[PDB]
Structures are given as structure tokens and as C-alpha cells.
Design a protein around this ligand. Sequence first.
Ligand SMILES: [Cu+2]
Ligand SMILES: [Cu+2]
Ligand SMILES: [Cu+2]
Ligand SMILES: [Cu+2]
Ligand SMILES: [Cu+2]
Ligand SMILES: [Cu+2]
Lengths: 334, 334, 334
Amino acid sequence: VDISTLPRVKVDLVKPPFVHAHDQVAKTGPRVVEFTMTIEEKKLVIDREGTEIHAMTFNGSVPGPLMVVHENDYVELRLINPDTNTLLHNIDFHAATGALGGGALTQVNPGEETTLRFKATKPGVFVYHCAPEGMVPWHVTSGMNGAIMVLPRDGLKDEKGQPLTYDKIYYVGEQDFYVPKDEAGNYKKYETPGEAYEDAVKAMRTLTPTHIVFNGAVGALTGDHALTAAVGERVLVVHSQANRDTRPHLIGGHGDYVWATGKFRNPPDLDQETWLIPGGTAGAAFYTFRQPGVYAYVNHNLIEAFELGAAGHFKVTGEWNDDLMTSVVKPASM
Amino acid sequence: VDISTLPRVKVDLVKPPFVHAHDQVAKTGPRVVEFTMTIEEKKLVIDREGTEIHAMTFNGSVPGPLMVVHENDYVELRLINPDTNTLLHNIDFHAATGALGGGALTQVNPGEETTLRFKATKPGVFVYHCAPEGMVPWHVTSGMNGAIMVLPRDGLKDEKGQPLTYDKIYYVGEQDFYVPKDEAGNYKKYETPGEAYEDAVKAMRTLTPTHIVFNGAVGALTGDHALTAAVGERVLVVHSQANRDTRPHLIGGHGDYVWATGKFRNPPDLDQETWLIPGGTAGAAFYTFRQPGVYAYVNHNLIEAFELGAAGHFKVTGEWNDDLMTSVVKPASM
Amino acid sequence: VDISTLPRVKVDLVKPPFVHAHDQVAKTGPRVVEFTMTIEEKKLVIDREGTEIHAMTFNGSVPGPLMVVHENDYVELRLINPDTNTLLHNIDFHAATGALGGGALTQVNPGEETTLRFKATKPGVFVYHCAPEGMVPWHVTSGMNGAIMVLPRDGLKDEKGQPLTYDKIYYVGEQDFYVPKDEAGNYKKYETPGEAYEDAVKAMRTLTPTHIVFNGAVGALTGDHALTAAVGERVLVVHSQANRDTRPHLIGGHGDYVWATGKFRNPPDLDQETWLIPGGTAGAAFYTFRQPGVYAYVNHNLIEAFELGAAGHFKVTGEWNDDLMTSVVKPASM
Ligand SMILES: [Cu+2]
Ligand SMILES: [Cu+2]
Ligand SMILES: [Cu+2]
Ligand SMILES: [Cu+2]
Ligand SMILES: [Cu+2]
Ligand SMILES: [Cu+2]
């Protein structure tokens, strides 16, 4: 095919956990979908104590934005590494085929840009991440990862082949950080990236994260930034973890339909309490809310959730169903 | 519906790994199934060395008892926190919808009780656990978790829709403990719960269990308390892990039909050697024994099994099948 | 059945990652398939630094060779423990039924041999490993494990029941080692096995591998020993991990059809980016290559891959498809 004969559509990305505009069922034939991301190395405060790290980001956020296309669209990404950064970066799409997912073709030094195109031949949610030869886990675990959703052209389907249509979508990126510690257990204070590298490596080799967070920081998806829904709304939560296994769980709900390893030509698993998303994968869970109130959404290693950061909230509006749950006798002495 | 028009049936629970009486296929219409549990904080010796912890239990056991209902029954639990305890507790059912699984409605101080009702709208095995705001993983990893089985009204089915009927059921609760250690590696000796809390938190944040046990202690499901079966019996083993992934395996057998993430509207996986039950989940495996003798049942991280405690035994009675396995030449010099 | 009436066929094993000759679709009726393995305790250098361990091997390799039979063949293994070894060993097949997978029938001291037969009643890839009572994880994590593939008699099938036929097969055994460390972090230097045992136990109880390798060493499946394929070839990669979870990923490709937990009566999962193989399991992934060049094949905990050793390479020959992926604008300043 002469790709130049296809429609081009430019996407304007949004910051997670929100997701840019798309149509579930494709309203056109295959397109070249044009994306731009600018790499930003920046300081980020990741916990309540004020711990500040040097993060490596796509588009300024941890995770990077969710990109959305349909099966057999072409993804055309312009990747910009401004001269205000100091490191070499690239990008690997798990949705793509060839050249280390794109990484072998997208190495950009500070002051460089590149444009990669690939055909999105398989439907699903997929991780993308930076992967510079010889320093791959350092970039990934500094926050340099996101996800892309490749929808089937006729949208999502249940285990029987009937449509599933979400009303809302959110993207939860989960990040394991390995902040170097001294022997007493305090995070080291690096009076450059090179000077940090060996103890970053040492810290990673412990295999023990210091922080495991959603949307880049402890508490990021809480308070004025809680996720929201109404009773009766159908919500898709895309969840990625580029480096380490996670086990999502909606406290007070379920995953009604879950693609735990994220690939839509497979039937979803029904009625999940908790699912395993392996490190290096994106998964997706669909739920119809049935009760109002606060929900937590967690990695159900509850130490990881409530001590290390892997917990967010939904605030859900609407009527309470006492058939479905009620306090028959409220807590009392007697 | 006027729930007061429905039959009530009172269940009398039993200590794991045994399971209270139920009928696989529902012999009545939907019911309100009434359960009572009394919280008990108590000392438990968890290993061969005599290490004693302060456990937090439902009904005196780690795990708490297995509760069994059918889909679209109502579970009505009276939860009692006697004044001989010292902490606040509650309960979250992963089977339930709303109010953090029940936790937001069931906070009981010592000297209080409460009664919660919920509709068991999804079939499967599910975790339940205590979850007091701000101290969730401490209670869970002190043993305060169990499981509930919500059977389909027409019992279990294989991947083709034909019945699967078990002759015996067992409930294996797997518990990760985080006993605080001093710098030399010995378990700290807490001359109160408050004085323990910070190092309990420190110990949990290592993400490294000190003990991983079935039925509350190293060796609990061995000797006079080995699980039993006969050749030709169909056995369902429900296995839960409220906080951490496990990978069960029957040494010398298989999971003929396994719902690894526990939800019965999905077809089972066939012929498993080993399955992954994510932390925060219950799973169920069905097996028909074909050979007599001793079997081990383990978490197949074999360090976790044989060094940290996650191993039990079956003793199986009956005839040996030499077609299926035989020693052609017994060990010898020659 | 009088097993003596069946054909006997002797298999001559090969060193991983290669796999001995077999036919996907069975060309005969059920057979007694005869295998011989000789246990070898030997020193192995496992990393670039020259760290040398005392490995415990089947047939001289880590992993042990892949054995291949068909469903309802009999596997007859002669297991030899020469008097040049010093330890007791045995073998447990996860494919087998009874006697702890064979371990209870195959205990051989140095200078002994034994012959075990079992019926391979379930199709799939399965772990085998040594398991001497009281020292199981030490032998497994010293390298004493491999896998066996029990093919359906009519070969592999996709999720719709149509044939899947591989052109090439490779066996990747992934090994977690726990080399004991002193307080400063250097590997201890054991001026016997008995003298090593307690700190081997200590090291394992950390649950933190020092090395996680494919084919027995860092870099073993790279350079002159990279895996190979051509564009358009169908490749099956069998992957085992006898003790610890892994999450394989082909960097630049996919698992087109994946049996993550390895059992062929189940439909494969399609289009996987990354799969979870639980510790104690073998899995299998089928992929048709579409692009030439270098691929990495990794455990996608990228710390485990690129710092601890769990990475190999494919070198793929053929034509590059610019429709599927191209650099539209190569990296440049502008
Ligand atoms: Cu980067
Ligand atoms: Cu990757
Ligand atoms: Cu409690
Ligand atoms: Cu929970
Ligand atoms: Cu051995
Ligand atoms: Cu095993």
C-alpha cells in the first residue's frame, strides 16, 4: 500500500489518568495516526516525606500518556529530545513489530528528534518504554514508560461476542522506584546522572522497590484528583507496569470483564476480584458501578498499596442499593 | 424484594482446612445465610523454633473459616469483637459490592458487634479480610483473613459445560508473616501492639516474609493433621492468599481443573502442574486421585515451601497403579 | 496392557537450547520412549566477573535437556549417579502421577542407577527437577532441573482447533541462583557441599536471587550462541522456571499463541506482549517472525534481564518490511 494515500489524523494527548479522544468503533478506514511527544527529564516529589527524584518522562508525566489507535492503523510518532535534557533516550512499543519495538530506530541525543511509523497489527493494550542499550532498567524505573491501546475496529467484545462499550476510561500507570539508600536506610542525597548511576544500579539489584505509585506519586489519584464515576456507568481501567508484576483490585467492586494480560482477541476473564498483570504488560478491566461512595483501587499486595504508595480512589455518585449491601445492625456495644 | 420473606438458614462454621456443610447444587431457592464470627487476638506459635506472634483472627484460626453460599443468596454476618481484645477491626468481603466490601460498615471496637448483609451476586471463591483504615496490611498479615465460596446454583461445571462434583473439599489458607528482626537476624523480643507497630511496618516494608505457612503454622497440615483422600476421590482444594502471590502445586499430582483466579463463570484451566493465585485472591483446583501414598501440596517457590513453611501433605489410601508409574529397576549399585 | 508388547524407541538427547528429534504428529501408536541421563556435579562460571559455583546437573547442562514424547506414551528413564559425584539425587517429573512425581522411587546415591517408567497421560510442557527430601530447593537452585514436552498425538492446535506447526523449537531454561554473600556483598569464597549448606540455606531464605540466567550463564544465548530464525519461520520457545515466577517477552515481537502455564488441552492466549510462567511451571510460546534483525528475549523484570542475567538474543535473517515498521525521519538535530 501507498501509505501516503491514507488519511492522516493528528492526536492531541492528555495527561494521565485521562485519555485522549477516540471512537471505540472505528468511524473511518485505516489511518496514519500522528502523535508527538517531548521527552522531559525533571525533578519529581514522589511521597509525603518530600523525597525528590530525577525522573525521566515522556511528555512530562509518569506514566507517559495513553495513545489510542485501532487495529491496522499506522502509529506515526515524532519523538523530541530537547537540548535542555542531558541523556540519550529512545522508545520501544510492545504493540510494534521489528527493531526492538522501535528502540533501534529512535535513539535521540539531546537536541535531536526522530519520527517512527509502525503498523498496529494486534489489538490490545501494550506497554511502551524507553530502552537505551546498556541502561534499560534505569530509564524504565525512572518513570520513562506509558501505554498504547490498539482497539479492535469493531470495539470491545465480551466472552460471547456481544459488544462491551465503556462510558469512561482511565489509565493507571504503576511505577516501581528504587531510590538508593544508605546503610542506615535514608535516601542518598546525587551535593549528576553519572554519579547516580552505580548506586541506581545497586538499588535496582536489591529487587526491592522503595516506592510503588500510581500516576507518579503517593496519593496522586486521591483527593481533588480521585477518579470519578456514577452508579450505572461502565468504566474501563487500563493499568500498566513496565517492570514488575502487579495485582489490581477495586476495593468494593470487581473486574466484571478483565483482559489481565491485555490482548483483545482473547475472551475476558469474568467477575475477577484481583488479576495479575505481569511486569512488562498492560491489562484492562471493565466494571459497571452498582454502589456510590468511596472505593480504593490498589495493587493487592497491601503492603505495596498502603505502605509503598500503590493506592488510588474513586468517588462514585448516586443512590445506595440496600438489597445489594446493608448494615442490618450498626456497630454497637450491647 | 422483601428479604424478610426469604428462608433463613444458620451455618455453624468449622476450623480450616475442613469446610462446613453445604450442597453443591442448591436444594432451595435463594436464602439469607446467617453466619457468626468472633474476633480473637491471641498468641500463636508459628514455627518449629517456637517463635510466638500476636495473631489477629476471625474465629480463633489462621486462616479464618471458609464460608459457603450459593449465587444470589444473601450473606448475613454477625461480627463480634469481645472486650477481651484490644484493637479495632472490621471485615471486607471481596465477594460483596459496596462500602469497601463491607469494611466501611463493620468497624467494631472491643466490646462491640455488628451485623452486615450483602447479596452474593458473583460465583467464585473470594478472599475476606480485616481492613481498618490506616492499618490494613498489619491486620491482614497478622492472620486476619479467610475466604468465602459462592457456588453457582447448579454446582460446578467443566470447560464443556458438564458437571464437576467433588467428594471432598479442603480450604488451604496461606499466610505471609513479617516477624520483625534485629540487625543480627533474630526475631525481636513486643518485655504492646502500639509498641510493635512501627517495627511491624518496617518489617512489612522489606517485602520479605519471615514465614509463609498453611493453616497458621509450619507443619500444620502434616502428621495427624495431613489432608486425606482415597484413590478415585474427587477433591476440591480452595487456596487463598490475601496479600501475596502464590503458586500451588500438588507434588505427584495435578490440578485437573483449575480456576486459578477463582471465578466460576470462567472455564477452568485443564491439567495444570502449577497455577498462579495473585495476592488478594482465592483460587480452586479440582483433582481426582489416581495413586495412593504421600503427596506434598506446596507453594512452588520451593524455598518458600521447604524453608519458610508453605508445604502440607496428603495421605492417600488405595491400590497402586503400575501402568501409570513403576520402578522398573530399583536404585542399585551395578 | 502388557507394556512389553509396545514398541521401544531410544532417544538421544541434545544440549539446550536445542531439542532432540521428534515428530509433532505421532507417526506410530503409543511407545515406550527410552531416555538415559547421567547426573554431573561440576563447577560452572555463571557471570562475566568469573563467579564459579558448584552446579548440580542432569546431563552436564543447566537446564537439563528437553525430553519430548506424545500423550499416552510411556517415559522410561535410566538415571545414573556416578561415583565421581558426592551427593544423593533423584528426579520428580511434573508430567507424572504418583510417588512425588517419581522422586520417592529414584533416590540414587553416588555409584547407583535406577530406571523409572511413567505414563505421560496429560499433554503439555512440564518441569522436571531433583528433589531429595530435606534439601529440595538447594538442588533445584543449584541447576538440577529441566523440562519434558508431552505433545498431543495430533500435534498442537490454535484456539479454533486448526493446526499449529512449528518449524523450529528452542528450550530456554531460566535459573535463579542464590550465591551466598558476605556482609560487604561479595560472594563467599566453600578454602565442601556440607560446609556450604547452611549459608546456601541462608542465601535462599533472602528470596533475592544473585543471578537469573538463561542456559546456565549470563550471556549464554548471545553471540555465537544466539538463537536464530528466518523471516516467515514459525518458532516454538519452551521456557521453564522450576522455582520462581518469570515473565517472558520477545523484544520486537510477540507470543502469537501462548500456553503461559504450558498445558495443551487449553486454548492458547493470543497476541501476548508478555506472559507469566509461575515458578514450578513450563510454558510455551509460538511466534511467526515478520522482521529480520536482532531481537532480545528476556524476563521482563528488566532489572532481572539486564542486571542479573535473564536475557538472550535471536538473530533473524531476511527482508525488512517497511509497511510494518520504518524510520520516517532518522534521528537528527534540526
Ligand atoms: Cu530514556
Ligand atoms: Cu519492554
Ligand atoms: Cu483486624
Ligand atoms: Cu482486599
Ligand atoms: Cu540433586
Ligand atoms: Cu516440583
